[PDB]
Design an enzyme around this catalytic site. Structure first.
Site, short mmCIF file in Angstrom:
data_model
loop_
_atom_site.label_atom_id
_atom_site.label_comp_id
_atom_site.label_asym_id
_atom_site.label_seq_id
_atom_site.Cartn_x
_atom_site.Cartn_y
_atom_site.Cartn_z
N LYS C 167 -25.80 46.56 40.97
CA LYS C 167 -25.29 45.04 41.34
C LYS C 167 -24.49 44.80 40.14
O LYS C 167 -24.48 45.62 39.20
CB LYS C 167 -26.50 44.40 41.22
CG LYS C 167 -27.80 44.79 42.26
CD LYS C 167 -27.44 44.24 43.72
CE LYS C 167 -28.20 44.91 44.55
NZ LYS C 167 -29.00 44.12 45.75
N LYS C 193 -27.08 54.03 44.51
CA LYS C 193 -26.36 53.80 45.78
C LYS C 193 -25.49 52.75 45.83
O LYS C 193 -25.36 51.91 44.86
CB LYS C 193 -27.76 53.27 46.71
CG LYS C 193 -28.16 51.98 46.92
CD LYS C 193 -29.09 52.16 48.24
CE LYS C 193 -28.11 51.71 49.13
NZ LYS C 193 -28.29 50.77 49.49
N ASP C 195 -23.93 49.41 47.65
CA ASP C 195 -24.67 48.35 48.11
C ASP C 195 -24.06 48.54 49.74
O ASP C 195 -22.82 48.88 49.69
CB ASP C 195 -24.87 47.07 47.65
CG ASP C 195 -25.70 46.03 47.56
OD1 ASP C 195 -26.59 45.94 48.70
OD2 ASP C 195 -25.90 45.20 46.40
N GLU C 196 -24.91 48.43 50.74
CA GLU C 196 -24.17 48.75 52.09
C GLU C 196 -23.03 47.79 52.38
O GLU C 196 -22.50 48.45 53.26
CB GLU C 196 -25.47 47.85 53.13
CG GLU C 196 -25.55 46.23 53.04
CD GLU C 196 -26.09 45.54 51.93
OE1 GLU C 196 -27.14 46.03 50.97
OE2 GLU C 196 -25.70 44.36 51.80
N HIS C 286 -28.97 52.59 56.27
CA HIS C 286 -28.88 51.12 55.59
C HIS C 286 -28.97 50.49 56.72
O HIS C 286 -28.16 50.68 57.85
CB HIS C 286 -27.99 50.88 54.68
CG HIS C 286 -28.25 49.30 53.96
ND1 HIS C 286 -28.21 48.41 54.78
CD2 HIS C 286 -28.85 49.07 52.88
CE1 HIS C 286 -28.44 47.28 53.91
NE2 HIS C 286 -28.92 47.63 52.84
N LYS C 326 -38.95 40.74 48.44
CA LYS C 326 -38.06 39.69 48.91
C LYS C 326 -37.91 39.33 50.20
O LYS C 326 -37.41 38.45 50.65
CB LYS C 326 -36.77 39.83 47.98
CG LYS C 326 -35.57 40.08 48.40
CD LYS C 326 -34.50 40.21 47.49
CE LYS C 326 -33.30 40.96 47.78
NZ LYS C 326 -32.39 41.76 46.82
O1 CAP Z 1 -28.76 44.65 48.81
C1 CAP Z 1 -29.98 44.70 48.56
O2 CAP Z 1 -30.47 43.66 48.64
C2 CAP Z 1 -30.76 45.65 48.49
O3 CAP Z 1 -29.81 46.41 48.07
C3 CAP Z 1 -31.72 45.73 47.36
O4 CAP Z 1 -31.35 45.23 45.98
P1 CAP Z 1 -32.31 44.83 45.12
O5 CAP Z 1 -33.24 45.89 44.86
O6 CAP Z 1 -31.58 44.37 43.82
O7 CAP Z 1 -32.82 43.53 45.79
C4 CAP Z 1 -32.20 45.82 49.38
O8 CAP Z 1 -33.09 46.52 49.60
C5 CAP Z 1 -31.71 46.53 50.87
O9 CAP Z 1 -30.23 46.75 50.59
C6 CAP Z 1 -32.18 45.30 51.43
O10 CAP Z 1 -32.56 45.76 52.55
P2 CAP Z 1 -33.85 46.18 53.42
O11 CAP Z 1 -34.89 45.28 53.66
O12 CAP Z 1 -33.23 46.87 54.51
O13 CAP Z 1 -34.64 47.10 52.49
MG MG Z 2 -28.31 46.70 49.82
#
Ligand code: CAP
Ligand code: MG
Ligand code: CAP
Ligand code: CAP
Ligand code: MG
Ligand code: MG
Ligand code: MG
Lengths: 464, 123, 464, 464, 159, 151
Positions: C167, C193, C195-196, C286, C326
């Site tokens: 991040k 990874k 971020d999508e 993702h 979250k």
């Molecule tokens: O982009 C994000 O927010 C994350 O990258 C997590 O970051 P954090 O670990 O810092 O929050 C998410 O898990 C997935 O991408 C969310 O989706 P999913 O419910 O599909 O897992």
């Molecule tokens: Mg993500």
């Protein structure tokens, strides 16, 4: 950097609620209809939607200091209460240009709608509109061709283009399909097409259908002396398969192919729009799966956005709804997005659900298609609501006529020319509607047969 | 139940599925065109009444779409009657011509209208 | 044919309502949760849903006699009241095999969900589950690799795989992305990874990101002596673009790529899975955009179906939810589809939302990934709920640690190895959870630091 | 694992004789006709045949404990005595899906028939039948086109298609081949063809023959006003050569090609079927070498299997035998596999040699071809035994006519149309046969000439 | 030898307005010039592919039209199709489409395109039988002043 | 269309001199330093430069009425004297985005500098600056890498 890294959670509000903010002409703006969870201040709900949509996460990460979020952060610059509505608002978010990959609806969608719709802090979220800046529009190809070239190619002016979906949906043979095609086309329809789920199955293989509908449309065009086309469905399971089919259509000289953009996907569509552009095919977009996203007024993505997205990725035609037929859709809203589909510039008009002025800096417009449960008696309304720059399709309404396809075609072609002249002589399709086709039913044996059959049918049901 | 004939029903796009337009009827058309701001224009053809595909078959290519311009687009004209005149004027001279009337929207650059003003004998 | 063609409308009910019906082993079956419009008998709703989903339209067309609808018609073989629910039912429909194009989720979805969700006669429609027959399963490639070969390749056994999303979301430069990566992995994370939404943007271009992350994972792998991997996002705007990125990851020799299957599309995903299969790259899916479709209990598609759809299309990893963090997700449902994702046969269990027995005839299983707003204090729960065959990801949870990435990595590795041994010694992750990490926090400096920072955080909010 | 690894030989019986066994819908089943060696209990024989065909060898290997043979082991679930037969039995074996590579007859035959036919412990073995489950059928493409589309394409309905093999077998020049071809075709045959050993030789090279036969069928079709075709032999020594010829026919626009599937092989066959599928050519398969495998009743493979194998690999036509002509074949058996070639479902009928119900889950069916030593006087029988959906071929019977090829053509055409109407008028081809052609020889000069020449010929000899 | 034209200057016309005409109108205007007795019509040197009219569209219609006009007159006709583009790949790609249409000449602004791209084009034309017309846009930037630059006789030699 | 097609020459000034004009944020703008020929009013020179650079020629062609020049014409929206300079001026011209092929500098230069430098009516012309709008900027790839990446 600047300001020590201080580990730990903080409300979103602190960084992504910026009512101060002055939008830049290059910003992507989005109107989200948010409905928070009980203890969630709208400006927090609104700040989560913007954070988790752009640069931020749930806790404090030092890395932020490596770059500058002022430049990158997505930002909630205003909330509005949804008058006369259950703790529901309009959070407005602005996304700097730098965040989106050029040419890619996929990218844009991954950001704006990626994860926020599942936040535990929200109970429902729905995107209503997005302002695409000219600086972003210029990075798309948009439609292979658009309204004017399509007309210019098929040589067809003044009046809605007419079409029919062969039925039954699945189960007809390569050859019957052809037969049916020729029969509808010689009657006076401009196009016939594959049902959105006719791809390549054990009953009929794409290459067989393609070869015979070519035979047939060629027969029907010679006969009538009017350019004909049959939408050949290239939707496939792999891009390679998809292109491979588009390639055959090209081999046959046929003029238009079709693609289910939402079940296919934006990545695949974009590819086909490029392939069509370079090869000169017109591409028809089918919006299968859409209502899975665009029905509920409280959660999802509104079709006007789905529609924008397509004028961006690529398509000559897009199904716009009928108001008056078998599937959901209100008139004002539809009018709204139809202008979003065909015009150059569309002024903001909350009346019609357009939350932002959209300037398309000359991206081609797309021909809206009215389809599904419509018949002869709706002619004058469709004609009214949509105008000449539309495609009106008769599936059931063509293969459903008592004397078969040819006749069923002729019925529709007359119904429409009829309405078109009424209009031109100055009649009022809205008030005078009913007499007009009624009148024409009298002089046309095929038109008559039709009238009698579907006279009592309507699909009035209180909308969602 | 009746078999839509397979043989002498060659069409001409818009309005060709209604009964032959009377001069009054036809007049309504030039009238509409006008009402809207389209510059009326005329084109006639004496040899290839219908599209063909002799020079090419790529997608979208058809021979026979282009017709001969009758004089020039009558920019500035407002006399519905004057264009009608022209139609008359051309069947005189090209009795064997197919003649058509079109309407240019110059802002959109699309032919907003087109209807055949005159088929030659036996069409 | 047989029985004169008799033009005109008729209720769906007459042909698509067949409670008589005995489902064949090769039929696709679908449990839809339908909510009709006031005057619509469920058995009509249910038959509209089955007709407009397979072979019919709204009026009578003679062509049906050309083929035989008994063979092809989609059929509503049963309704059920949703106990304690607002005129809501479970229409159960059966689709003969002959209707779907082999290997194509695109085609399957086009049919089952194409148009029915926007019928005027319905007010809400939602697909809850689909039974895929072995005869149709066998037509799919499935995952490039699946649980066993992925562990076999990376050489990793007995415990959840650990990962982290770098991040900020957007805004970091190619170089900084690598630095962050090396730092997270040297710490003890298995994977890091994209971020999508990190694809190719002005702030950081895909090939520069890929080149530096390779340098970095290679550094961390050598340092630790454990195979490392960085999910490189191949999501792009055209298939050609997509393949092109996949091809460079291959050139660098790195082990895994990633793809947002929903914003990308099934057509493009399947093409990537194939490419990954033939070039031996693991693929991480993702599910961005999924909550737009799967949130509301009354309208849409349920994730278990989206989950199924992917195991067919192709993916080695799929995000399964966290329950505890979250974003929205409940435990039982989750356990439910997690089995649909990994097991060979899964017995029906309405308790858990599984409406049909699913036999995967050896299609490889997919590794669920638990991500989003989870930290050190959730370890034991996740471990509990998911077991060894899962990937647990720490975005914020890693880059948010007071001593930066390396230590934050270490923190999570210890927390997890901590839970694993507790488990193996026979402790009870569910009762004894809290002491276990609490105990560990005492012996590990990095772990400590973490514990103190996220101690008070939880995301309890009443679910949708 | 489980149960210590105990080195040494054990009888097969212990793991591969499982009369307990309950066959699974996805199992491949095989009915082998075994003839042990004096001291071999059938259930040992039977378990050797099942072990050495799936997972086992002659001694105990520890690796078995790495996997689970219960999952994988082939299994002999029942023996039966061959009533009124020399220590001959029917061992029935079940092979689980998991053991066969999808789309590969090559794979499937490598297992089932790979090594057991040479066991010392057996003295003779022969496969009589195999049950291909739908979950394995759906993995094949099957015929490029099938009966329906072939008729649809060539525009041919109600009656057997007629064809001729040019003779002499080898030694004719490209030019003469074309001469002979036009001449057969103008007379009224639908097809002429290459003799299965006509590839490319010093006397006439494939490209030369293709060019001239194209000239000639195009002449003949013009002249008759009836679509014509000439099987062009693509059987070659390497796949590259083979496809290369396939490619030339495509360039000529000709409609069918041919391939000796057994001497070429399955691997090359399947390649060809795919090529045909994608390029729209019909493929005729010629079963050269088959009698090497299928004649003896005690050892080999029964043609019903070879015939199943082809409908899986791909073929539009397959030679099925004549019953009544120069080579071996009995009526019932024939009736039995002909249905296996064209029907959708074929119920088990030990009468007719079918040991298992065969569901083809819509694989297209293949058109059986009747050829070798048949003439004018066999017409009525063939027509009787085969039905309209058959190709009947006149090699000698055409270039053997006293007035040459055209006339000979004409002869067979009338003979057959003659039979066809008699049939349709309700006469009895079987009882009334003989008058019927006899009658017609009266009204047809060409037909008469025929009758006179082959009147006394039959090929009655006591079958094997 | 190719166009079958002898004894006198060949005549030609640049369709106008410079930019803003639709693919279709361009074709209209082209047939109309050509039937009158001009040998050639052509793209204005800044007519490449723009929002108002895309190169593939113009090529298709101008093909229709010169083919009409040639039939009608009984005199070989041609329409310069502009291949000047932003990248060699794009440029050749258009060259390739004219070849597919059977049309006889293409055109290229050699100076704004460049020598490197020009030469590529000449080779392509050579091997595929198209005639190339060069348009000297930008030249006056170099060749006007008598004291500084390059004299067109050189630019002309260079071509 | 509108306004009869009236054949014959007309000064450029009539359509290409528009001091009225309000530049759009997507316009390409160009600062040309013009030096006319003796009897050429700067507002003619300036209009010649704008016309022969976008949509027009030297005489009146009917085809204009097929489209609409207000959308497409290049336009001279101001002249300025070059303080302390031999009849030399700064003509400012505005070119609507619709005129340029995306991603092609070759196209952009072919328009703005293709024929104008050689008009008989001018004795010298020089392009001093071009305002490239964000909407056209985003159509270029730009540098393979740029300063940060290289470093
Ligand atoms: O982009 C994000 O927010 C994350 O990258 C997590 O970051 P954090 O670990 O810092 O929050 C998410 O898990 C997935 O991408 C969310 O989706 P999913 O419910 O599909 O897992
Ligand atoms: Mg993500
Ligand atoms: O398959 C159908 O149901 C149609 O083909 C119409 O057949 P009928 O004309 O016989 O009903 C539908 O319009 C579109 O396909 C439905 O969608 P849309 O709302 O997106 O136009
Ligand atoms: O070469 C031949 O002998 C034939 O060509 C027939 O020629 P005639 O018609 O002159 O005999 C034979 O049918 C098949 O070729 C023999 O096999 P099959 O049993 O498999 O049909
Ligand atoms: Mg449809
Ligand atoms: Mg033979
Ligand atoms: Mg010029």
């Amino acid at each position: 950097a600047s300001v020590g890294f201080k580990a730990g959670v903080k409300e979103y509000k602190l960084t992504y609620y910026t009512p101060e903010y002055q939008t830049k002409d290059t910003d992507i703006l989005a109107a989200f209809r948010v409905t928070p969870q009980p203890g969630v201040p709208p400006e927090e709900a609104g700040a989560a939607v913007a954070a988790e949509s752009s640069t931020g996460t749930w806790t404090t990460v030092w890395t932020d200091g490596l770059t500058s979020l002022d430049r990158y952060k997505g930002r909630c610059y205003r909330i509005e209460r949804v008058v006369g509505e259950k703790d529901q608002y309009i959070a407005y978010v602005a996304y700097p240009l730098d965040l989106f990959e050029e040419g890619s609806v996929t990218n844009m969608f991954t950001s704006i709608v990626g994860n926020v719709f599942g936040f535990k802090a929200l109970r429902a979220l729905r995107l209503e509109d997005l302002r695409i800046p000219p600086a972003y529009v210029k990075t798309f190809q948009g439609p292979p061709h658009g309204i004017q070239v399509e007309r210019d190619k098929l040589n067809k002016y003044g009046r809605p283009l007419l079409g029919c979906t062969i039925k039954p949906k699945l189960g007809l043979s390569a050859k019957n399909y052809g037969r049916a095609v020729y029969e509808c086309l010689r009657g006076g329809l401009d196009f016939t097409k594959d049902d959105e789920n006719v791809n390549s199955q054990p009953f009929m293989r794409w290459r067989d259908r393609f070869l015979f509908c070519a035979e047939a449309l060629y027969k029907a065009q010679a006969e009538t002396g009017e350019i004909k086309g049959h939408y050949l469905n290239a939707t496939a399971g792999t891009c390679e398969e998809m292109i491979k089919r588009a390639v055959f259509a090209r081999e046959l000289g046929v003029p238009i192919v079709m693609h289910d953009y939402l079940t296919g996907g934006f990545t695949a569509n974009t590819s086909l729009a490029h392939y069509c552009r370079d090869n000169g095919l017109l591409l028809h977009i089918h919006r299968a799966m859409h209502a899975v996203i665009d029905r509920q007024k409280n959660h999802g993505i509104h079709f006007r956005v789905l529609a924008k997205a397509l004028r961006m990725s690529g398509g000559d035609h897009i199904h716009s709804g009928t108001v008056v037929g078998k599937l959901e859709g209100e008139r004002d809203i539809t009018l709204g997005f139809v202008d979003l589909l065909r015009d150059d510039f569309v002024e903001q008009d909350r009346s019609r659900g357009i939350y932002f002025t959209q300037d398309w800096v000359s991206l081609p417009g797309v021909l809206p298609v009215a389809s599904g449960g419509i018949h002869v008696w709706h002619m004058p309304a469709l004609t009214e609501i949509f105008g000449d720059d539309s495609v009106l399709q008769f599936g059931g309404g063509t293969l459903g006529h008592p004397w078969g396809n040819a006749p069923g075609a002729v019925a529709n072609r007359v119904a429409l020319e009829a309405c078109v002249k009424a209009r031109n002589e100055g009649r009022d399709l809205a008030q005078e509607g009913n007499e007009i086709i009624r009148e024409a039913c009298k002089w046309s044996p095929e038109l008559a047969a039709a009238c009698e059959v579907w006279k009592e049918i309507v699909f009035n049901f209180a909308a969602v | 139940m009746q078999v839509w004939p397979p043989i002498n029903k060659k069409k001409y796009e818009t309005l060709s599925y209604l009964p032959d337009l009377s001069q009054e009827q036809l007049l309504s058309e030039v009238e509409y065109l006008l009402k809207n701001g389209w510059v009326p224009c005329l084109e006639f053809e004496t040899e290839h009444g219908f599209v063909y595909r002799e020079n090419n078959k790529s997608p979208g290519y058809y021979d026979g779409r282009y017709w001969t311009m009758w004089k020039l687009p009558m920019f500035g004209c407002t006399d519905a009657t004057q264009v009608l005149a022209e139609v008359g004027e051309a069947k005189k001279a090209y009795p064997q011509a197919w003649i058509r009337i079109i309407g240019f929207d110059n802002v959109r650059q699309v032919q907003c209208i087109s209807f055949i003003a005159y088929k030659p004998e036996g069409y």
